C-alpha cells in the first residue's frame, strides 16, 4: 500500500484504520467516542474526521487504509467540521469546570480548548434534579455532562457482557441508564464501575461517602479507623503526577494521619484473615471431599453476578467474609478488647479501588448488635480529592508506618489486588495446613497474568487437585456458558469481576486513552504488589504475627466456633 498523509508518503503492508496508522506514525488525530477498539456505531462523534481526496470527509477511527489514499488531517474543511461537532456538544453541556470533579483530567475540556469551540447558546439548567440520579449505593449519573458517546455502554458490554448500561428513549430524548431507568442496584448490574472508568467526563461518578468520613472525623466522641486496600498503594500516586507503578505506601500512612484519622490500619491484614478462614475451609472441604467446587467470595461484583445469574452457585461460595468486611467485624469486637474503646464509638473507614465495595458495606446484615462492620467506603479518587482539599503535599511527604495491631501483613495478603493473587495466597496456607508442614516454594506463576481464564493442577497432600482463576466478569460467563466448568472436576475457583483484578477497579484513577497505549496499566499497577511480596519477610497469611496473636487471644482456631460465627457470612437463594 502507498499512503499519502499531509503530503508525506508512506509504504506499508499493514491492514488497519486511518486512526491507528496515524497514531503509530506520530501524526495527530483527535478522537472522542473511540475506546476499547470501539466507537459509537449509531451516532458517531466524528471528532476523528479526516479528508480523503476523491471521497470527502470520513471518520478515521473506523475507516481502513487503502493503497492510493491521499489524506489531509488538518485542512480548513476538517477543522470546521470538528469544531462544529464540539460546539453542538457544548449546547447540551453544563460548562462550569470550576466545581467539577474531572476538572483536572477531563477529555472534553482538552478538546474544547484545542479547537477553541464555543456553544451556540450556553446550557444552563435551573433544576439539575431531573438530570441527576443518586439512588444507587455505588454509582451516580449527571446527565448535564453526558456527551452520549456510548463509551460506558461499550465498556459494560465488553467487560461484563451484562449490558446493564443501555441507551434509553426518555420523553423522546436519548439518555444512558439502567433498564427501564431503574436504580442500578435493582437490576443485573454488578456495580463494578467499569462504565465510570470509560467515561471521558464527569457524567458518571462513584456515590460519595466523603461527608460520612468528614462528619465522623469532626465528631468528638468518634474514634475513626482507616484502612486501605492492596491496590491503592500502587496507584494513587498517579493523581499527584508521580508517574505509573510507584509504591507510595508510606506516604499514604502519613497523609491519613495529617487528615485527622485516629488509627492507621490496613486491609491487607484483613486479607490475611480471609486466607486463614478460606484455606481452613478448603482443607475441610477436602477431608469430606466436597462440596466442590469452592468459589471465592471476596469480590462483591462477582457475588452480585452469582446472585443475578447463577444463584445455584451461592451455596458453593466460601463462607468467609471479604477482607473489607472481615476486618470491619474485628474492628468492632477484637479491637475494642485491646484498646478499651467503646465499640459504638468506633467508626471504620476503608479506601478501595472499587465502587462495588460501597454496596457490600451497606448490606443490611453486614452488622452485629447494631454495629456496622464498615461505616464508610471511599475510592482511590475520593482519597485523592480529600488530600488535595487539605492542601497536603503528598509527593513530598516522608514515609511513616501503620499501627501494628491490625496493620501488619504478609506477602500473601499484599498480592490480593492482582488477578490470581487470592488463589496463590490461599494455596500457600492450605498446602501447609493439609500436609502439616512449612513448604518453601510458594510461588504459583501459572495463575498469574492477564489471560481471561487460567488453570493449574496442584498437589495437596497425597493427591491432585484442579484450580481455576476467572479474570473478568465476561470471562465468568464464558467459563460457564461454554461448559468449561464441566470438562473436569474443579475444587477451588477464584473470580474477579474487573479484568486485571482490583488494580483495575471502578474506583481507580482515570487514564488518558493514549497513555493506555504507552502503559499497560494492569501489569504496572500489579508489579508493585508482587514487588512487596518478593521483599517481605513473611509471605504466608498464617505467619502474620499480629494476626496469630489475635486468633490465639480472642477468636480461637479459624474455621469453627467463635471464628465461624462472626467472621463468616452466608448467601441464601430465594
Ligand atoms: N475486601 C477486599 Fe480485596 C482485599 O484485600 C480489596 O480490598 Fe480488592 C483490592 N485491592 C478491592 O476492592 S476485593 C477482591 N479480592 C481481592 S483484593
Ligand atoms: S465534564 Fe469536563 S468540560 Fe464539563 S464541566 Fe466538568 S471539567 Fe468542564
Ligand atoms: S455517561 Fe459518560 S461514557 Fe456514557 S455516554 Fe455519557 S459521556 Fe459517554
Ligand atoms: S457498574 Fe459494571 S455492570 Fe453496572 S453498568 Fe457499569 S460496567 Fe455495567
Ligand atoms: S474485582 Fe476488585 S475492584 Fe472489581 S468489583 Fe471485584 S472487588 Fe471491586
Ligand atoms: S472517534 Fe471516530 S467517530 Fe467518534
Ligand atoms: Mg475526630
Coordinates of C-alpha atoms and ligand atoms in Angstrom, one line a residue:
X1 CA 0.0 0.0 0.0
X2 CA 1.0 3.6 -0.7
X3 CA -0.4 6.2 1.6
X4 CA -0.2 10.0 1.4
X5 CA -0.9 11.8 4.7
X6 CA -0.4 15.6 4.9
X7 CA 2.0 15.4 1.9
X8 CA 4.1 12.7 3.4
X9 CA 4.3 9.3 1.6
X10 CA 4.1 6.0 3.4
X11 CA 4.7 2.5 2.3
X12 CA 3.1 -0.3 4.3
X13 CA 1.5 -3.7 4.2
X14 CA -0.5 -3.2 7.4
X15 CA -4.2 -3.5 7.3
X16 CA -5.6 -1.1 9.9
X17 CA -7.6 2.1 10.4
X18 CA -6.5 5.6 9.4
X19 CA -6.6 6.5 13.1
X20 CA -4.3 3.6 14.2
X21 CA -1.9 4.1 11.3
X22 CA -1.5 7.8 12.0
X23 CA -1.0 7.3 15.8
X24 CA 1.8 4.9 15.1
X25 CA 3.5 7.5 12.8
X26 CA 3.3 10.5 15.1
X27 CA 0.5 12.1 13.1
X28 CA -2.1 13.7 15.4
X29 CA -5.7 12.8 15.0
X30 CA -8.3 13.7 17.7
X31 CA -10.9 11.2 18.9
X32 CA -13.7 11.1 21.4
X33 CA -16.0 8.1 21.3
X34 CA -13.3 5.6 20.1
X35 CA -12.2 3.5 23.0
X36 CA -11.6 -0.2 23.8
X37 CA -11.4 -0.8 20.0
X38 CA -15.0 0.6 19.7
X39 CA -16.7 3.7 18.6
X40 CA -20.3 4.9 18.9
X41 CA -21.8 3.0 16.0
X42 CA -25.3 4.7 15.9
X43 CA -24.3 8.3 16.5
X44 CA -20.6 8.8 15.8
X45 CA -19.0 11.8 17.4
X46 CA -17.0 12.5 14.1
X47 CA -14.2 14.1 16.1
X48 CA -11.8 11.8 14.3
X49 CA -12.7 13.4 11.0
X50 CA -10.1 13.5 8.2
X51 CA -10.3 14.4 4.5
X52 CA -9.7 11.7 1.9
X53 CA -9.1 13.1 -1.6
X54 CA -11.8 11.9 -4.0
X55 CA -14.1 10.8 -1.3
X56 CA -14.6 13.6 1.2
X57 CA -14.8 13.7 5.0
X58 CA -14.5 10.3 6.7
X59 CA -14.2 9.0 10.3
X60 CA -10.6 7.8 10.8
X61 CA -11.4 5.6 13.8
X62 CA -13.4 3.1 11.7
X63 CA -12.1 3.5 8.2
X64 CA -9.4 1.1 6.8
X65 CA -6.3 2.4 4.9
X66 CA -6.3 1.8 1.2
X67 CA -3.5 2.0 -1.4
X68 CA -3.6 5.3 -3.3
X69 CA -5.3 7.2 -0.4
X70 CA -4.3 10.9 -0.1
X71 CA -5.3 12.1 3.4
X72 CA -5.5 15.5 5.0
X73 CA -6.0 15.7 8.8
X74 CA -5.7 19.5 9.3
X75 CA -7.5 21.1 6.3
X76 CA -9.8 24.0 7.0
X77 CA -12.8 21.8 6.0
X78 CA -11.8 19.2 8.6
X79 CA -11.2 21.6 11.4
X80 CA -14.5 23.4 10.9
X81 CA -16.3 20.1 10.9
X82 CA -14.7 19.0 14.2
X83 CA -15.2 22.4 15.7
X84 CA -18.9 22.3 14.7
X85 CA -19.4 18.9 16.4
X86 CA -17.8 20.1 19.7
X87 CA -19.9 23.3 19.6
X88 CA -23.0 21.1 19.3
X89 CA -21.8 19.1 22.3
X90 CA -21.3 22.4 24.2
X91 CA -25.0 23.2 23.5
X92 CA -26.0 20.3 25.7
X93 CA -23.2 20.6 28.3
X94 CA -23.2 22.5 31.6
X95 CA -19.8 24.1 31.1
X96 CA -18.7 25.0 34.6
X97 CA -15.4 23.3 35.2
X98 CA -14.8 25.1 38.5
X99 CA -16.5 22.8 41.0
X100 CA -16.3 19.8 38.6
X101 CA -14.6 16.5 39.8
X102 CA -13.0 15.9 36.4
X103 CA -11.7 19.5 36.1
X104 CA -8.0 18.5 36.0
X105 CA -8.2 15.4 33.8
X106 CA -11.3 15.9 31.6
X107 CA -11.0 14.8 27.9
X108 CA -13.8 17.1 26.7
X109 CA -12.2 20.2 28.1
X110 CA -9.0 19.5 26.3
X111 CA -11.0 19.2 23.0
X112 CA -12.8 22.5 23.7
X113 CA -9.5 24.3 24.3
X114 CA -7.7 22.7 21.3
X115 CA -10.3 23.7 18.7
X116 CA -11.4 26.8 20.7
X117 CA -15.1 25.9 20.2
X118 CA -18.0 27.8 21.9
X119 CA -21.7 26.9 22.3
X120 CA -24.3 28.4 20.1
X121 CA -26.1 29.0 23.4
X122 CA -24.8 28.0 26.9
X123 CA -26.7 25.1 28.5
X124 CA -27.6 26.3 32.0
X125 CA -30.3 24.2 33.7
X126 CA -32.2 25.7 36.6
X127 CA -33.0 22.4 38.3
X128 CA -30.5 19.6 37.9
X129 CA -32.8 17.3 39.9
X130 CA -34.3 15.9 36.7
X131 CA -30.8 15.4 35.4
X132 CA -29.1 13.6 38.3
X133 CA -29.5 10.1 39.6
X134 CA -28.0 9.4 43.1
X135 CA -30.2 6.5 44.2
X136 CA -27.5 3.8 43.9
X137 CA -25.1 3.0 46.8
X138 CA -22.2 2.8 44.3
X139 CA -22.9 4.8 41.1
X140 CA -24.2 8.3 40.3
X141 CA -25.3 9.9 37.0
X142 CA -25.1 13.5 36.0
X143 CA -26.7 13.9 32.5
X144 CA -25.8 17.6 32.3
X145 CA -22.3 16.4 31.4
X146 CA -23.1 13.4 29.2
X147 CA -21.9 13.6 25.6
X148 CA -23.8 10.5 24.6
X149 CA -20.5 9.0 23.4
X150 CA -21.6 5.4 24.3
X151 CA -18.2 4.6 25.8
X152 CA -19.9 3.4 29.1
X153 CA -22.3 1.2 27.2
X154 CA -19.5 -0.4 25.2
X155 CA -17.3 -0.9 28.2
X156 CA -20.2 -2.6 30.1
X157 CA -20.7 -5.0 27.2
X158 CA -17.0 -5.8 26.8
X159 CA -16.1 -6.1 30.4
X160 CA -19.2 -7.9 31.9
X161 CA -21.4 -8.9 28.9
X162 CA -24.4 -7.9 31.0
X163 CA -25.3 -4.6 29.2
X164 CA -26.7 -3.2 32.4
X165 CA -25.8 0.2 30.9
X166 CA -28.1 1.0 28.0
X167 CA -29.2 3.8 25.7
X168 CA -32.8 4.8 26.6
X169 CA -35.6 6.7 24.9
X170 CA -36.7 9.1 27.7
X171 CA -39.5 11.5 27.0
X172 CA -38.5 11.3 23.3
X173 CA -34.9 12.2 24.3
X174 CA -31.9 9.9 24.3
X175 CA -30.1 9.1 27.6
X176 CA -28.0 6.4 29.1
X177 CA -29.0 4.5 32.2
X178 CA -30.2 1.2 33.7
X179 CA -33.0 -1.0 32.4
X180 CA -36.3 0.9 32.5
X181 CA -34.4 3.8 34.1
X182 CA -34.5 1.9 37.4
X183 CA -31.9 2.2 40.1
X184 CA -28.8 0.3 39.0
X185 CA -28.8 -1.7 42.3
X186 CA -32.3 -3.1 41.4
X187 CA -31.0 -4.6 38.1
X188 CA -28.5 -7.2 37.0
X189 CA -25.8 -4.5 37.3
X190 CA -22.7 -5.7 39.1
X191 CA -21.8 -2.2 40.3
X192 CA -18.2 -2.8 39.1
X193 CA -17.9 0.8 37.9
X194 CA -16.1 -0.1 34.6
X195 CA -18.5 2.3 32.9
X196 CA -17.1 5.1 35.1
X197 CA -13.6 4.3 34.1
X198 CA -14.6 4.6 30.4
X199 CA -16.4 8.0 30.8
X200 CA -14.4 10.9 29.3
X201 CA -16.3 13.4 31.5
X202 CA -18.0 13.8 34.9
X203 CA -21.3 12.3 33.8
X204 CA -20.6 9.0 35.7
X205 CA -19.1 9.1 39.2
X206 CA -19.0 7.0 42.3
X207 CA -21.5 7.5 45.2
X208 CA -19.7 9.9 47.5
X209 CA -19.0 8.9 51.1
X210 CA -16.8 11.9 51.9
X211 CA -19.4 13.5 54.0
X212 CA -19.7 10.4 56.1
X213 CA -16.0 10.5 56.7
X214 CA -15.7 14.2 57.5
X215 CA -18.7 14.2 59.9
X216 CA -17.1 11.3 61.7
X217 CA -13.6 12.9 61.9
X218 CA -15.1 16.1 63.4
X219 CA -17.4 14.2 65.8
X220 CA -15.5 14.4 69.1
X221 CA -16.7 11.1 70.5
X222 CA -16.0 9.1 67.3
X223 CA -12.8 7.1 67.0
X224 CA -12.1 6.9 63.3
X225 CA -10.2 3.9 62.0
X226 CA -8.9 3.9 58.4
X227 CA -7.6 1.0 56.3
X228 CA -6.6 0.9 52.6
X229 CA -6.9 -1.8 50.0
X230 CA -3.9 -3.6 48.4
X231 CA -4.4 -1.7 45.2
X232 CA -4.5 1.9 46.5
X233 CA -0.8 2.0 47.4
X234 CA 0.1 1.1 43.9
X235 CA -2.0 3.6 42.0
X236 CA -2.9 6.8 44.0
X237 CA 0.5 8.3 43.0
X238 CA -0.8 8.9 39.5
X239 CA -3.2 11.6 40.6
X240 CA -0.3 13.6 42.1
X241 CA 1.8 13.5 38.9
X242 CA 4.2 10.9 40.3
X243 CA 4.0 8.6 37.3
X244 CA 2.9 5.0 37.0
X245 CA 3.9 2.0 39.1
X246 CA 5.1 4.0 42.1
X247 CA 4.9 2.4 45.5
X248 CA 3.6 5.2 47.8
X249 CA 2.6 3.1 50.8
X250 CA 4.4 5.1 53.5
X251 CA 3.3 8.5 52.1
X252 CA -0.4 7.4 52.4
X253 CA 0.1 6.5 56.0
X254 CA 1.5 9.9 56.7
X255 CA -1.3 11.6 54.7
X256 CA -4.0 9.8 56.6
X257 CA -2.6 10.9 59.9
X258 CA -2.5 14.5 58.7
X259 CA -6.1 14.2 57.6
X260 CA -7.0 13.6 61.2
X261 CA -7.6 9.8 61.4
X262 CA -7.3 8.3 64.9
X263 CA -5.9 4.9 63.9
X264 CA -4.0 3.7 60.9
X265 CA -4.6 0.1 59.9
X266 CA -4.5 -1.9 56.6
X267 CA -6.9 -4.1 54.7
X268 CA -4.1 -6.5 53.8
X269 CA -4.3 -7.5 57.5
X270 CA -7.9 -8.4 56.7
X271 CA -6.7 -10.2 53.6
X272 CA -4.6 -12.5 55.8
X273 CA -7.7 -13.1 57.9
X274 CA -9.7 -14.2 54.9
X275 CA -7.0 -16.6 53.9
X276 CA -6.9 -18.1 57.4
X277 CA -10.6 -18.9 57.1
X278 CA -10.8 -19.8 53.4
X279 CA -7.7 -22.1 53.4
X280 CA -9.1 -23.9 56.5
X281 CA -12.5 -24.3 54.8
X282 CA -10.8 -25.6 51.6
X283 CA -8.8 -28.2 53.6
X284 CA -12.1 -29.1 55.4
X285 CA -13.9 -29.5 52.1
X286 CA -11.1 -31.9 51.0
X287 CA -11.4 -34.1 54.1
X288 CA -15.1 -34.6 53.2
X289 CA -14.3 -34.1 49.5
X290 CA -16.9 -31.5 49.0
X291 CA -19.0 -29.7 48.2
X292 CA -16.9 -29.0 45.1
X293 CA -16.0 -26.6 43.7
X294 CA -15.4 -23.9 46.2
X295 CA -15.7 -20.3 44.8
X296 CA -14.1 -17.2 46.4
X297 CA -16.5 -14.6 47.7
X298 CA -14.2 -11.6 48.3
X299 CA -15.4 -9.8 45.1
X300 CA -18.9 -8.2 45.6
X301 CA -19.0 -7.7 41.8
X302 CA -18.9 -11.4 41.4
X303 CA -21.2 -12.1 44.3
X304 CA -23.9 -10.0 42.6
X305 CA -23.2 -11.8 39.3
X306 CA -23.8 -15.1 41.1
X307 CA -27.0 -13.8 42.8
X308 CA -28.3 -12.4 39.5
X309 CA -27.4 -15.2 37.0
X310 CA -26.1 -18.3 38.8
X311 CA -27.9 -18.5 42.2
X312 CA -27.2 -22.2 42.4
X313 CA -23.6 -21.4 42.9
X314 CA -24.3 -19.4 46.0
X315 CA -24.0 -22.5 48.2
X316 CA -20.6 -23.2 46.7
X317 CA -19.3 -19.8 47.8
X318 CA -16.7 -19.6 50.6
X319 CA -18.5 -18.6 53.8
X320 CA -15.5 -16.4 54.9
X321 CA -16.2 -12.6 54.7
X322 CA -14.3 -10.4 52.4
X323 CA -11.1 -8.7 53.7
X324 CA -13.1 -5.4 54.0
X325 CA -16.0 -6.9 55.9
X326 CA -13.9 -9.4 58.0
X327 CA -11.6 -6.5 59.0
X328 CA -14.6 -4.4 60.0
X329 CA -16.1 -7.1 62.1
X330 CA -12.9 -7.5 64.1
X331 CA -12.6 -3.7 64.4
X332 CA -15.9 -3.6 66.4
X333 CA -15.0 -6.7 68.5
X334 CA -11.4 -7.6 68.8
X335 CA -10.0 -4.1 68.5
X336 CA -12.0 -2.7 71.5
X337 CA -10.8 -5.6 73.5
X338 CA -7.2 -4.4 73.2
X339 CA -7.9 -0.6 73.2
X340 CA -10.7 -0.1 75.8
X341 CA -12.7 1.9 73.2
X342 CA -16.5 1.8 73.4
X343 CA -17.5 -0.3 70.3
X344 CA -20.3 2.1 69.4
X345 CA -17.8 5.0 69.2
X346 CA -15.6 3.1 66.7
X347 CA -16.1 4.3 63.1
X348 CA -14.4 2.2 60.4
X349 CA -13.5 3.7 57.0
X350 CA -11.9 1.8 54.1
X351 CA -10.1 3.1 51.0
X352 CA -10.9 1.0 48.0
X353 CA -10.2 0.8 44.2
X354 CA -13.8 -0.4 43.9
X355 CA -17.3 1.1 43.7
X356 CA -19.0 -2.2 44.4
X357 CA -17.4 -2.2 47.9
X358 CA -19.8 0.6 48.9
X359 CA -22.8 -1.7 48.3
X360 CA -21.2 -4.5 50.2
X361 CA -20.6 -2.3 53.2
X362 CA -24.2 -1.1 53.2
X363 CA -25.7 -4.6 53.0
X364 CA -28.4 -4.9 55.8
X365 CA -27.0 -8.0 57.5
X366 CA -23.4 -6.8 57.4
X367 CA -23.6 -5.8 61.0
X368 CA -23.7 -7.2 64.5
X369 CA -25.6 -6.0 67.6
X370 CA -26.5 -2.8 65.7
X371 CA -22.8 -2.1 64.8
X372 CA -21.9 -1.9 61.1
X373 CA -18.8 -3.8 60.1
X374 CA -17.9 -0.9 57.8
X375 CA -19.4 2.6 58.3
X376 CA -17.9 4.3 55.2
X377 CA -16.1 3.5 52.0
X378 CA -14.1 6.0 49.8
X379 CA -12.5 5.3 46.5
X380 CA -8.9 6.0 45.4
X381 CA -10.2 9.1 43.6
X382 CA -12.1 10.3 46.7
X383 CA -9.0 9.9 48.9
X384 CA -7.0 12.0 46.4
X385 CA -9.5 14.8 46.3
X386 CA -9.6 14.8 50.1
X387 CA -5.8 15.0 50.3
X388 CA -5.7 17.9 47.8
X389 CA -8.5 19.9 49.6
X390 CA -6.5 19.7 52.8
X391 CA -3.5 21.0 50.7
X392 CA -1.3 18.2 51.8
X393 CA 1.9 18.0 49.7
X394 CA 1.6 14.2 49.0
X395 CA 4.6 13.8 46.7
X396 CA 7.0 15.4 49.3
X397 CA 5.7 13.5 52.4
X398 CA 8.0 11.2 54.4
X399 CA 7.3 7.6 55.0
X400 CA 5.5 6.6 58.2
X401 CA 4.1 3.2 59.3
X402 CA 0.7 1.8 60.1
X403 CA -0.2 0.8 63.7
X404 CA 0.8 -2.9 64.2
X405 CA -2.4 -4.3 65.9
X406 CA -4.3 -4.7 62.7
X407 CA -1.7 -3.2 60.3
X408 CA 0.8 -5.9 59.7
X409 CA 0.5 -8.1 56.6
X410 CA 2.4 -10.9 54.7
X411 CA 3.3 -11.1 51.1
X412 CA 0.3 -13.3 50.5
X413 CA -2.1 -10.6 51.6
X414 CA -0.1 -8.0 49.6
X415 CA -0.9 -9.6 46.2
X416 CA -4.7 -9.8 46.7
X417 CA -5.2 -6.8 44.4
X418 CA -3.9 -8.7 41.3
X419 CA -5.8 -11.4 39.4
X420 CA -4.7 -14.8 40.7
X421 CA -3.4 -13.1 43.9
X422 CA -6.1 -14.6 46.1
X423 CA -5.6 -18.1 44.5
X424 CA -1.9 -18.0 45.2
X425 CA -2.2 -16.7 48.7
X426 CA -4.7 -19.4 49.6
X427 CA -2.6 -22.2 48.2
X428 CA 0.4 -21.1 50.3
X429 CA -1.6 -21.7 53.5
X430 CA -3.9 -24.6 52.5
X431 CA -1.0 -26.6 51.3
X432 CA 0.8 -26.0 54.6
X433 CA -2.3 -26.8 56.6
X434 CA -3.2 -30.2 55.0
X435 CA 0.3 -31.5 54.8
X436 CA 1.2 -30.1 58.3
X437 CA 4.5 -28.6 57.1
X438 CA 6.2 -25.4 56.2
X439 CA 6.9 -25.7 52.4
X440 CA 9.4 -23.2 50.9
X441 CA 8.4 -22.9 47.3
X442 CA 5.4 -20.7 47.5
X443 CA 5.2 -19.1 44.0
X444 CA 2.4 -20.1 41.7
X445 CA 3.1 -18.3 38.4
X446 CA 0.6 -20.3 36.4
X447 CA -2.4 -18.4 38.0
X448 CA -0.8 -15.0 37.2
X449 CA -1.1 -12.7 34.3
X450 CA -3.9 -11.2 32.1
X451 CA -5.2 -14.3 30.5
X452 CA -9.0 -14.4 30.8
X453 CA -9.2 -17.9 32.1
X454 CA -6.3 -19.5 33.9
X455 CA -6.0 -23.1 35.1
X456 CA -3.5 -25.1 37.2
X457 CA -3.1 -28.6 38.7
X458 CA -1.9 -28.7 42.3
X459 CA -0.8 -31.5 44.6
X460 CA -2.1 -31.1 48.2
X461 CA -1.2 -34.0 50.5
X462 CA -1.1 -37.3 48.6
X463 CA -3.4 -36.1 45.8
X464 CA -4.0 -34.0 42.7
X465 CA -6.5 -31.1 42.6
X466 CA -7.7 -28.6 39.9
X467 CA -7.8 -24.9 40.4
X468 CA -9.0 -22.1 38.1
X469 CA -8.8 -18.3 38.0
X470 CA -11.5 -16.3 36.3
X471 CA -10.3 -12.9 35.3
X472 CA -13.1 -10.5 34.5
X473 CA -16.9 -10.9 34.7
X474 CA -17.3 -11.6 31.0
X475 CA -14.9 -14.4 31.4
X476 CA -17.1 -15.9 34.1
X477 CA -19.9 -16.0 31.5
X478 CA -17.6 -17.7 29.0
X479 CA -16.4 -20.3 31.5
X480 CA -20.0 -21.3 32.4
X481 CA -21.8 -21.0 29.1
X482 CA -19.1 -22.8 27.1
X483 CA -19.3 -25.7 29.5
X484 CA -15.6 -25.4 30.5
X485 CA -16.6 -25.9 34.1
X486 CA -17.9 -29.4 33.2
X487 CA -14.7 -30.5 31.4
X488 CA -13.1 -31.6 34.6
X489 CA -13.8 -31.5 38.4
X490 CA -12.6 -28.2 39.8
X491 CA -12.0 -27.9 43.5
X492 CA -11.1 -24.2 44.1
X493 CA -12.1 -21.3 41.8
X494 CA -11.2 -17.6 42.0
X495 CA -13.4 -15.0 40.4
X496 CA -12.7 -11.3 39.9
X497 CA -15.3 -9.0 38.2
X498 CA -12.8 -6.5 36.9
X499 CA -10.2 -7.7 34.3
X500 CA -6.7 -7.5 35.8
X501 CA -8.2 -7.7 39.3
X502 CA -8.8 -4.9 41.9
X503 CA -5.8 -2.9 40.4
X504 CA -8.2 -2.2 37.5
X505 CA -11.2 -1.4 39.8
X506 CA -14.1 1.0 39.1
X507 CA -12.9 3.4 41.8
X508 CA -9.4 3.8 40.3
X509 CA -7.8 6.9 38.8
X510 CA -8.7 7.8 35.2
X511 CA -6.1 7.4 32.4
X512 CA -5.9 9.2 29.1
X513 CA -6.7 6.8 26.2
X514 CA -3.2 7.3 24.7
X515 CA -1.3 6.8 27.9
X516 CA -3.1 3.5 27.9
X517 CA -1.4 2.8 24.6
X518 CA 2.0 3.6 26.2
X519 CA 1.5 1.9 29.5
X520 CA 0.0 -1.5 30.4
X521 CA -1.9 -0.1 33.4
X522 CA -3.0 -3.6 34.7
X523 CA 0.5 -5.1 35.0
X524 CA 2.3 -1.9 36.0
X525 CA -0.1 -1.4 39.0
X526 CA 0.2 -5.2 39.8
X527 CA 4.0 -5.2 39.6
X528 CA 4.1 -3.0 42.8
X529 CA 2.1 -5.7 44.7
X530 CA 4.3 -8.6 43.6
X531 CA 7.4 -6.5 44.4
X532 CA 6.3 -6.1 48.0
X533 CA 5.7 -9.9 48.2
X534 CA 9.2 -10.6 47.0
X535 CA 10.8 -8.2 49.5
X536 CA 8.7 -9.2 52.5
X537 CA 10.0 -11.5 55.4
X538 CA 6.6 -13.1 55.9
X539 CA 4.9 -14.5 52.7
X540 CA 2.2 -16.6 54.2
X541 CA -1.0 -15.3 55.9
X542 CA -0.5 -17.7 58.8
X543 CA 2.9 -16.2 59.5
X544 CA 1.4 -12.8 60.3
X545 CA 2.4 -12.4 63.9
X546 CA -0.1 -9.6 64.8
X547 CA -2.8 -11.9 63.3
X548 CA -1.6 -15.1 65.1
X549 CA -1.8 -13.1 68.3
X550 CA -5.4 -12.1 67.6
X551 CA -6.5 -15.6 66.9
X552 CA -4.8 -17.1 70.0
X553 CA -6.1 -14.4 72.4
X554 CA -9.5 -13.7 71.0
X555 CA -11.0 -15.7 68.1
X556 CA -9.5 -19.2 68.8
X557 CA -8.9 -21.6 65.9
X558 CA -10.1 -20.4 62.4
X559 CA -13.0 -22.2 60.7
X560 CA -15.0 -23.2 63.7
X561 CA -16.6 -22.0 66.9
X562 CA -16.2 -18.3 67.6
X563 CA -14.3 -17.7 64.3
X564 CA -17.1 -19.3 62.2
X565 CA -19.9 -17.5 64.0
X566 CA -18.9 -13.9 63.4
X567 CA -16.1 -13.9 60.8
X568 CA -18.3 -15.8 58.3
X569 CA -21.3 -14.8 56.1
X570 CA -23.7 -16.9 54.1
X571 CA -25.7 -16.0 51.0
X572 CA -29.1 -17.5 50.7
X573 CA -31.1 -18.2 47.5
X574 CA -34.7 -17.0 47.3
Ligands
LIG1 N1 -12.1 -6.6 50.5 C1 -11.3 -6.7 49.8 FE1 -9.9 -7.2 48.5 C2 -8.6 -7.1 49.7 O1 -7.8 -7.2 50.5 C3 -9.7 -5.2 48.2 O2 -9.5 -4.6 49.2 FE2 -9.8 -5.8 46.3 C4 -8.3 -4.8 46.2 N2 -7.3 -4.1 46.2 C5 -11.0 -4.5 46.2 O3 -11.9 -3.7 46.2 S1 -11.5 -7.3 46.8 C6 -11.5 -8.8 45.7 N3 -10.4 -9.6 46.4 C7 -9.0 -9.1 46.0 S2 -8.4 -7.5 46.8
LIG2 S1 -17.0 17.5 32.4 FE1 -15.1 18.5 31.7 S2 -15.8 20.2 30.4 FE2 -17.7 19.5 31.5 S3 -17.7 20.9 33.4 FE3 -16.5 19.0 34.0 S4 -14.3 19.6 33.6 FE4 -15.6 21.1 32.5
LIG3 S1 -22.1 8.6 30.7 FE1 -20.0 9.2 30.0 S2 -19.3 7.4 28.8 FE2 -21.6 7.2 29.0 S3 -22.4 8.3 27.1 FE3 -22.4 9.9 28.8 S4 -20.4 10.9 28.5 FE4 -20.2 8.9 27.3
LIG4 S1 -21.3 -1.0 37.1 FE1 -20.4 -2.6 35.8 S2 -22.2 -4.0 35.3 FE2 -23.1 -2.0 36.1 S3 -23.5 -0.7 34.2 FE3 -21.4 -0.2 35.0 S4 -19.9 -1.6 33.8 FE4 -22.1 -2.5 33.6
LIG5 S1 -12.5 -7.1 41.1 FE1 -12.0 -5.8 42.9 S2 -12.4 -3.7 42.3 FE2 -13.5 -5.0 40.8 S3 -15.6 -5.3 41.6 FE3 -14.4 -7.0 42.4 S4 -13.6 -6.3 44.4 FE4 -14.3 -4.5 43.3
LIG6 S1 -13.9 8.9 17.5 FE1 -14.3 8.2 15.4 S2 -16.5 8.6 15.2 FE2 -16.1 9.0 17.3
LIG7 MG1 -12.0 13.5 65.4

